[PDB]
Design a protein around this ligand. Structure first.
Ligand code: HEM
Ligand code: HEM
Lengths: 145, 145
């Protein structure tokens, strides 16, 4: 199933993911925080999962939130690095899903991250072409939830 | 405390961490698996915490072990990347400590990774000077457990 979702990651999709990540991943703290705060802004209900982070309205200045946002970017870094080897991509995605499954985060709930990603990409001038490529990567993760 | 331990990362310690990581981090899968397998071999008592991974002796052939090993290296990548900013290093270490605290991994238990790190470093011609620098970084995590 995850192997099948990974099949949608064509040469063109992997190329756009890599090119866009070259920029997005160059500032993990700034964009990581951008992603997290955008998620909470567009889907306030997702905040229910982050009680531990405390006052998320503080954004960047919130040490726990900042700590989570930076760390989040390294999971994406991991995924991008494994793109050329489906066997490694799959084992890394399934490993990643373990804790999110335990948190009872469904594929549908996880899919809510697509909006914030599209926005973060757009702030760096990466159009729909790139947003669609990223949604396909997220779909691989969704297949594991 | 974690804030006092982070202050122990002096100029040269950070430099040695970077120079050695430049090589060790070049092959996250190979070195990540070597690190994990060495831990289980030298400290079989720690295998109990990794029941979900299955037969850990299969090494590279064990998909779950390979997934965990690769992912492990990205946490180290994170720490190295935050060396410039103590505030970020700390929030990233505290974030990392959460799940390990939940598994009841004590500071003394975590410290068992020092052996495997020393050996992997040694396999790449990096001596005690470097093993000691890494022990200091590990001490930062131990302070948060
Ligand atoms: C592309 C999107 C995402 C990435 C790359 C990502 C990455 C991560 C990483 C690396 C961690 C730390 C390791 C762990 O505990 O699993 C984490 C923690 C967590 N994630 Fe995800 N995640 C994503 C989306 C989501 C979404 C959509 C939710 C829920 C609506 C979610 C909820 C959580 C929670 C609650 C934690 C624990 C936070 C804490 O207490 O520090 N994640 N995630
Ligand atoms: C250099 C040291 C280490 C690093 C960088 C590291 C890294 C990680 C990462 C990134 C994860 C995935 C996220 C999470 O679930 O928290 C993890 C999982 C885990 N770690 Fe650590 N860890 C280290 C040492 C240890 C040690 C020494 C133990 C215990 C003796 C330990 C026990 C665990 C366990 C049981 C898991 C879950 C494995 C699974 O079910 O997939 N870790 N660690």
């Amino acid at each position: 199933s995850v192997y099948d979702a990974a099949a949608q990651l064509t040469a063109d999709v992997k190329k756009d993911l890599r090119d866009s990540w070259k920029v997005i991943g160059s500032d993990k703290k700034g964009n990581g925080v951008a992603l997290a705060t955008t998620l909470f802004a567009d889907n306030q209900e997702t905040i229910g999962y982050f009680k531990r982070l405390g006052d998320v309205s503080q954004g960047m200045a919130n040490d726990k939130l900042r700590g989570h946002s930076i760390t989040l970017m390294y999971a994406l870094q991991n995924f991008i690095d494994q793109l050329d080897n489906p066997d490694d991509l799959v084992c890394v995605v399934e490993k990643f899903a373990v804790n999110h499954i335990t948190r009872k985060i469904s594929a549908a709930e996880f899919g809510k991250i697509n909006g914030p990603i599209k926005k973060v990409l757009a702030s760096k001038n990466f159009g729909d072409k790139y947003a669609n490529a990223w949604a396909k990567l997220v779909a691989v993760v969704q297949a594991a939830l």
